[PDB]
C-alpha cells in the first residue's frame, strides 16, 4: 500500500468510527484477520514458512 495511507491508518483517527485495520506486515487493507493482524497473502506465506505458532494446514 501507499506509505501515506499506512501512516494515516496507524495514527489515531479523528472519529473513532473512521479507523481501519491494514495488514501490519503488508499494508493491505482487504482481508485482514483480527486474531493475528496480517492479511490473506501474509497469513498464507507466513504460516507456510512457520513463523505463526499453532497455525498448520487443515485437512479434516
Amino acid at each position: 500500500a501507499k506509505t501515506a495511507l499506512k501512516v494515516k491508518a496507524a495514527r489515531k483517527p479523528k472519529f473513532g468510527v473512521r479507523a481501519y485495520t491494514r495488514c501490519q506486515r503488508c499494508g493491505r487493507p482487504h482481508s485482514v484477520y483480527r486474531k493475528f493482524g496480517l492479511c490473506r497473502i501474509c497469513l498464507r506465506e507466513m504460516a507456510h514458512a512457520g513463523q505463526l505458532p499453532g497455525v498448520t494446514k487443515s485437512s479434516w
Binding site: 497473502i41 497469513l43 505458532p53 499453532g54 497455525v55 498448520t56 494446514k57 487443515s58
Partner: protein
C-alpha cells in the same frame, strides 16, 4: 484444591509439561489428580490461495490449542514454592489458581 491450567499448541510439549509438574509435586509429596484433557480449541482460517481473481482454490489452516488440567489436592507450601519457581518450555503457558 490448587488448579493448574496448561495451554499450548503441541500436545507433546503439553504432555511433557504435565508429566514434569505431576512428578515434581509428587517428589514433594502432595498427591495430585491426574492430568485431565480439556477439549482442544479449534480455530479455522480459509484463505484464497492466489493473490488475485482465483477464489475457487483455497487453503485452510487451524490453530489448535491443547489444554490440560491438574489439581494439587495437598496444600504443601513447599510444592507451592516449587511450582512457582520451576522452568517450563516457552511454547506452553501455566495458570495457577490458588
Amino acid at each position: 484444591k490448587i488448579r493448574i491450567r496448561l495451554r499450548a499448541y503441541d500436545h507433546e510439549v503439553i504432555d511433557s509439561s504435565a508429566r514434569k509438574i505431576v512428578d515434581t509435586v509428587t517428589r514433594t509429596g502432595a498427591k495430585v489428580a491426574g492430568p485431565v484433557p480439556l477439549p482442544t480449541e479449534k480455530n479455522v482460517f480459509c484463505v484464497i490461495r492466489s493473490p488475485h481473481k482465483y477464489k475457487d482454490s483455497r487453503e485452510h489452516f487451524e490453530m489448535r490449542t491443547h489444554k490440560r488440567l491438574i489439581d494439587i489436592l495437598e496444600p504443601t507450601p513447599k510444592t507451592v514454592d516449587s511450582l512457582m519457581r520451576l522452568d517450563l518450555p516457552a511454547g506452553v503457558d501455566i495458570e495457577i489458581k490458588l
